[PDB]
């Protein structure tokens, strides 16, 4: 028997001590080795309730990622609280590794095995575990990258559906790759991302239909972000240490939801040295990008959406890409987990 509680978690990883890659280095000092024989007990005839939007596991992961980035990605210039801090800014090796979050003695993690569980409500199917699955700390906006897929159906996630101020997480049940490349050889900050139109539009169509199920079969329309910082209006992520900003206009194409637009989709991108820190602490300036082919291939496994408020007589609903938290990224991976206290 068990009871709901919050406590300080620890982390585990398979980080290599000889590796200079910053996630490896951090985890070597801040985390323990993984368990090769992890226990998982299915809780027979037990129903447990979850709430991904009120889950202290999420807040704790954010702290770690903030801490990781702060000691690993020193900029040449940092603009924070009106102050400027300078230090050395060598190019680094950067590639996220899976991190498991685990409970200490007297506590355990409950896992919801409901395939179509939406992150809020009751879960009949529950298994206890010592540690979560390995979650890569991928920091991004609009699109969730290299993250777990829905087992069965596409799931729409939101703290409240009726409310428009609450971010919507679309959990994909099938990956779509992103290939971003800064070619070796003009403009060293010029880049692009290639996506498969046929595959993506098939998925996007399904997401539209899924959304229809939740909004009284109203018409679903995608539009580009109304405004804001470049970090949210564009697809923002970190690739091999370089901060990428990718235009997503082409990805949310209404007319393709079909003509011969089944070919490769190429998003225009730029690498920026001066950025707004996702930590919310201000602005940082980095050195210009390394030479040669900068390339990251990533699955698209989630989408962040904001719905337009004020629909009236018109039955349409408009959605725009971009989430309003980095915590939501971790939320999407931790939605099926919660900490409880053992009696």
């Amino acid at each position: 028997v068990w009871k709901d509680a919050d406590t300080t978690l620890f982390c585990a990883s398979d980080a290599k001590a000889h590796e200079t890659e910053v996630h490896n280095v951090w985890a070597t000092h801040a985390c323990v080795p993984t368990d090769p024989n992890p226990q998982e007990i299915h809780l027979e005839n037990v129903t447990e309730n979850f709430n991904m939007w009120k889950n202290n596991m999420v807040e704790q992961m954010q702290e770690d990622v903030i801490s990781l980035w702060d000691q690993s990605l020193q900029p040449c210039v940092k603009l924070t609280g009106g102050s400027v801090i300078k230090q050395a800014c060598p190019k680094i090796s950067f590639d996220p590794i899976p991190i498991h979050y685990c409970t200490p003695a007297g506590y355990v993690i409950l896992k919801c095995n409901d395939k179509n569980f939406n992150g809020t409500g009751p879960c009949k199917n529950v298994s206890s575990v010592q540690c979560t699955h390995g979650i890569k700390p991928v920091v991004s906006t609009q699109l969730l990258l290299n993250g777990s897929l829905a087992e069965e159906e596409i799931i729409i996630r939101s703290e409240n559906l009726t409310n428009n101020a609450k971010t919507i997480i679309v959990h994909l049940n099938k990956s779509v790759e992103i290939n971003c490349t800064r070619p070796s050889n003009g403009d060293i900050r010029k880049a692009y991302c290639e996506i498969n139109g046929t595959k993506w539009n098939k998925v996007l169509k399904q997401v539209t239909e899924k959304l229809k199920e939740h909004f009284n079969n109203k018409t679903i329309i995608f539009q580009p972000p109304s405004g804001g910082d470049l970090e949210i209006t564009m697809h923002h992520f970190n690739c091999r240490g370089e901060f990428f900003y990718c235009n997503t206009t082409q990805l949310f194409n209404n007319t393709c939801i079909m003509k011969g637009c089944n070919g490769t989709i190429t998003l225009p991108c730029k690498i920026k040295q001066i950025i707004n820190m996702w930590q919310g602490t201000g602005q940082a300036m980095y050195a210009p990008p390394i030479d040669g082919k900068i390339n990251c291939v990533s699955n698209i496994t989630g989408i962040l959406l904001t719905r337009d408020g004020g629909a009236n007589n018109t039955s349409n609903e408009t959605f725009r890409p971009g989430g309003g938290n980095i915590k939501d990224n971790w939320r999407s991976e931790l939605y099926k987990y919660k900490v409880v206290q053992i009696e």
Partner: antibody
Amino acid sequence: QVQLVESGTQFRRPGASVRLSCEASGYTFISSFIHWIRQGPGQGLEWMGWMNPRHGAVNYPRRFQGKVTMTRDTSIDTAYMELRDLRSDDTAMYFCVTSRTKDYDWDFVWGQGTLVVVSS
Amino acid sequence: DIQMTQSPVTLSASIGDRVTITCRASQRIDNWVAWYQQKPGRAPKLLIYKASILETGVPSRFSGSGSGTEFTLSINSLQPDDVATYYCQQFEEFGRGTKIDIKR
């Protein structure tokens, strides 16, 4: 006390644009969404949109889309709403708005209002 | 997709009397609602939130209730200072407004 203090009443000529400011104090500017609402003379309240201070995220209703622009200044805790292509029917009282309650953006605290008069 | 309708459009009552304002929600499903007081040539003031919870600094005579479609704002004993326009609210939607008027 949570407080929003907006700029004084403005006078513009049709076709021109206006920029309205909202100075926040008494709370963490970053913590909650900022909304804008307009009141026609002898009329009800109309929601114009909301803005997120940390990343500048913006939401607009169908009617004000393309006609309204919301901007933020994090360093001075001041929010802005810019209205363009001003019309005679844009003459109204505009309010910058924020939420007193934690975790609930919708409950609101009202700024004293900024009257915008559009005349040639 | 939710619309708020207030009744009555105008409400005329004597001092010391109980006053009730009705707000109806089209969507049919809600648990949260706010009420506001607005005096002439003055900004609105939050009175009630979460349907039945009083804002700080608001007199005890003010109460809120209601479930589902219908919500009500009640004044236990009307005071001359309460004469103003009152609005209800659900998310981005407001009611048309009711003007409390001193009856003669």
